[PDB]
Write an enzyme that holds these catalytic residues in place. Structure first.
Site, PDB file in Angstrom:
ATOM      1  N   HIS A  75       9.310  -3.890  -3.147  1.00  0.00           N
ATOM      2  CA  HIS A  75       8.514  -4.521  -2.102  1.00  0.00           C
ATOM      3  C   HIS A  75       9.386  -5.106  -0.986  1.00  0.00           C
ATOM      4  O   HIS A  75      10.331  -5.852  -1.254  1.00  0.00           O
ATOM      5  CB  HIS A  75       7.618  -5.600  -2.694  1.00  0.00           C
ATOM      6  CG  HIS A  75       6.519  -6.037  -1.776  1.00  0.00           C
ATOM      7  ND1 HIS A  75       5.861  -5.167  -0.938  1.00  0.00           N
ATOM      8  CD2 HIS A  75       5.972  -7.257  -1.559  1.00  0.00           C
ATOM      9  CE1 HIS A  75       4.957  -5.831  -0.241  1.00  0.00           C
ATOM     10  NE2 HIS A  75       4.998  -7.101  -0.597  1.00  0.00           N
ATOM     11  N   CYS A 120       5.143  -0.397   2.983  1.00  0.00           N
ATOM     12  CA  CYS A 120       5.581  -1.779   3.146  1.00  0.00           C
ATOM     13  C   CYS A 120       6.833  -1.883   3.979  1.00  0.00           C
ATOM     14  O   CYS A 120       6.988  -2.854   4.748  1.00  0.00           O
ATOM     15  CB  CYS A 120       5.658  -2.514   1.797  1.00  0.00           C
ATOM     16  SG  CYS A 120       6.971  -2.023   0.714  1.00  0.00           S
ATOM     17  N   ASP A 129       0.799  -1.238   0.000  1.00  0.00           N
ATOM     18  CA  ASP A 129       0.000   0.000   0.000  1.00  0.00           C
ATOM     19  C   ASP A 129       0.843   1.306   0.000  1.00  0.00           C
ATOM     20  O   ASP A 129       0.274   2.409   0.127  1.00  0.00           O
ATOM     21  CB  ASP A 129      -0.970   0.000   1.199  1.00  0.00           C
ATOM     22  CG  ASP A 129      -0.251   0.179   2.572  1.00  0.00           C
ATOM     23  OD1 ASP A 129       0.956  -0.149   2.707  1.00  0.00           O
ATOM     24  OD2 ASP A 129      -0.909   0.630   3.526  1.00  0.00           O
TER      25      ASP A 129
END
Lengths: 308, 316
Positions: free
Chosen positions: A223, A99, A96
């Site tokens: 990520h 992370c 979102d």
């Protein structure tokens, strides 16, 4: 049938943890950066999974584990290459924008940063405490990768990235450094290639005042995930290499005493097949705030049912 | 942000409850029907919601409450017509075929019948215990509405967990179920009415009902809210019902029991008379409802309330 995060196994307990998080932050009045009093010392370990039959093991992994990042990092020999150290496992994390915080938060407490307490602590630090030395360290690492007053505006932009505006801005290497100084605990990011990979040490703190077990995150394709240990002879440690991992935002004095800094801030041991490794913390989350034991009980109950 | 069932607030605790459920069933060796030792005595109440501002109240109701059935039953004056008694509220329930059990299970313990413990207890009863008297009672109520042996064997097969993942369950199964629970059930909506555990003496039964709502082939629990008063904790045993005040149907009676109907109600429920609006205007009857008595170790409602409290601070 099994839920997709550890915290969903006892949302009430996760709320308790997330309520305790902001009261544990101490905000000094004299410019010392704000920091966690107690909760930075906590570390999460996954439950054993190998006692379950392979097909039902697979149902647990699909539920909890981020298998994309786990495979990318194993294939490239960054993760779980060393046979003498314990296996690390990537838990799923929300993409979102926040992370880094979700990952770091999960590693210590088993919950994500849903209330933006870590994210806001970062921002609050950068807006309210002296950042002169962070700016310096950042400028120095930036110049190493390459004459003007354009430095000042990139820095103000990096502070604006730390806020909770637009769902959220992504966070780069300097924020990870600032974050380990908030946690008084080093962070090790394992990745491909993606200059984010390396060791962040809380250098604005003397080592004696810091927690000497790292937070281990994995990183791929913008990520972050936590890389946690499993509870099961192999040594509980993360390899610091053969080529050394990058140690970030050093000055040139500190860069000359690099190996001694590692020894101060982490607990360094040499591994057999000589390369170094940092000791990892054991699961020390008390039952009142241990989401893992709760998730394990759902699994045990669902396994009885799974069997005939 | 808020979850769509009470149990999702602490799945670990819900598992504890669902593990305790089958160990509490006692299977007699002398032919008595199998039954719950302790857990049939538990009753769930919703937390108060009126202290939250109306917009955020609405977020809780949309999450937990089955607003379709709540509206259908209120509009038709079956539910919450009586101003002297507490408000009842319909919680959501799965329409997977086993909703009678999900509804009944939720009413007592705040969890659905996901492990089919209530459903399997019903089936097991009907396959393994003497059903002669249930069959008789069934035939008698069936004839009142109008090959007997094959319909009965079909009703036993409906109770199983075979071949809308499960077969739906009709009135006789609700009757058999209250005898497993030693606790009467009231369904507000021919399924509508009172099921009393008549294979038990009243002294051995729990004298607070399980209150379910029913519409369009769907059962839900109709639970009470934790309130300040002054209104009485009770469910009316009569309908307002267009014209005139009219008793609820009491199911599967023999004709002896049907003559002493009012005394049976007094034995199996705790009947009180309510002041009737108008006051010759005079008292219709109601059954007392149980208070929330689920100990903290198995109280999902307190856990869900704490998520709400936490989410409300953020909302503001």
């Amino acid at each position: 049938v099994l839920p997709q995060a550890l915290y969903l196994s006892n949302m009430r307990k996760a709320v308790k943890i997330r309520e305790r998080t902001p009261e544990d932050i101490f905000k000094p009045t004299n410019g010392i950066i704000h920091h966690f009093k107690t909760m930075h010392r906590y570390t999460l370990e996954m439950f054993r999974t190998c006692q379950f039959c392979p097909q039902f093991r697979e149902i647990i992994h699909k539920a909890l584990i981020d298998r994309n990042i786990q495979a990318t990092l194993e294939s490239q020999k960054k993760l779980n290459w060393c046979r003498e150290v314990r296996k690390l496992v990537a838990l799923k994390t929300n993409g979102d924008g926040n992370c880094l915080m979700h990952a770091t938060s999960q590693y210590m407490w088993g919950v994500q940063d849903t209330d933006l307490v870590l994210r806001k602590a970062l921002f609050s630090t950068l807006k309210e405490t002296d950042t002169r030395n962070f700016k310096f360290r950042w400028q120095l690492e930036s110049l190493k990768s390459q004459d003007t007053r354009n430095w000042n505006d990139e820095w103000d932009n990096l502070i604006k990235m730390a806020s909770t505006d637009t769902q959220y801005n992504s966070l780069e290497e300097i924020h990870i450094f600032v974050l380990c100084n908030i946690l008084r605990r080093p962070i090790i990011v394992i990745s491909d290639k993606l200059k984010v990979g390396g060791i962040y040490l809380p250098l604005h703190w003397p080592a004696q005042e810091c927690y000497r077990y790292p937070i281990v995150l994995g990183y791929d394709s913008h990520h972050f995930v936590p890389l946690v240990t499993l509870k099961d002879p192999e040594i509980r440690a993360v390899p610091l290499v053969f080529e050394d991992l990058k140690v970030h935002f050093l000055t040139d004095p500190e860069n000359e005493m690099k190996e001694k800094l590692l020894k101060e801030y982490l607990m360094v041991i040499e591994i057999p097949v000589l390369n170094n490794a940092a000791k990892l913390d054991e699961a020390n989350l008390p039952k009142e705030i241990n989401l893992v034991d709760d998730y394990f009980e759902l699994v045990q109950h669902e396994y009885k049912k799974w069997q005939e």
